[PDB]
């Protein structure tokens, strides 16, 4: 409770397992629907990537979002994620789906939702479950798609920390008195 970093984190692990097994026999049953989870795995991580950076109150205005969005598009480009290039931006679709991570999210959500989950520690605790949940999807293809998945995975995580670290600097110069960042 005093270190949601480890506590709330371990609660997630359990949930993940339960589902892990739940949707494990189906993936091995047939080699196809498992590959569908690969595309959704990225997309879920992508719409969330943008949403995470966007929602973060410490990153509302000109917090480097423009570049953050393009980076993801560039990174998702090499991956080979289905999509299309519109004007000058690459985008797959509107929110993947998240039918797996959402299931474990519900279990832990109803369990934690406590003061420990309050602390901003839940931030870093982003690749904890994914690393696992996504590991399963890797089972259907832990060879290639895996290399691609593990890449876009760490790529996004570092993309946020790097973009956040920068914005954080701007936040320091933001506070003042008037016209701090109204951009009227």
Swiss-Prot record:
Immunogenic protein that elicits T-cell-mediated immunity in mice. Its main location: secreted. Active in pH ranges of 3.5-10.5. GO terms for molecular function: GTPase activator activity; guanyl-nucleotide exchange factor activity. Activator for both CDC42 and RAC1 by directly interacting with these Rho GTPases and acting as a guanine nucleotide exchange factor (GEF). This activation results in actin cytoskeleton rearrangements and stimulates membrane ruffling, thus promoting bacterial entry into non-phagocytic cells. Keywords: GTPase activation, Guanine-nucleotide releasing factor, Secreted, Virulence. It comes from the Bacteria. One of its GO terms (biological process) is actin cytoskeleton organization. GO terms for cellular component: extracellular region. It comes from Burkholderia pseudomallei (strain K96243). Changing residue 139 to P: Loss of GEF activity. This is Guanine nucleotide exchange factor BopE. Belongs to the GEF (guanine exchange factor) SopE family. It is found in: Secreted. Monomer. Interacts with human CDC42.
